[PDB]
Amino acid sequence: NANVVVRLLIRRPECFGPALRGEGGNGLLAAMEEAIKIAEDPSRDGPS
């Protein structure tokens, strides 16, 4: 199951999100810091 899942995920790289996708996607650390900032700042975390 692990091998099959890894193969499918690498066949479809969009599953990793905006980051980790490449071609302009930032690193995992940058994505996590950006998400922390988004959570801290309203009007980007909630609906408003």
């Binding site: 690498i10 066949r11 790289p13 071609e23």
Partner: protein, 49 residues
């Protein structure tokens, strides 16, 4: 075949591109001599001189 760069590149990626295979020469290779396309040769004018 990657178009990402300004020029076209060939890279081993998880995206697949279709390659068409065309033949140049086969294993028959009839006898010797018998000038074949894409050969390196010398053009001699006189009596091998």
């Amino acid at each position: 075949l990657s178009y990402g760069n300004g020029s076209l590149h060939v890279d081993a990626a998880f995206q697949q591109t279709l390659w068409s295979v065309a033949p140049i020469s086969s294993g028959s290779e009839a006898a010797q001599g018998y000038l074949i396309g894409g050969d390196v040769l010398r053009l001699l004018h006189g009596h091998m001189d």
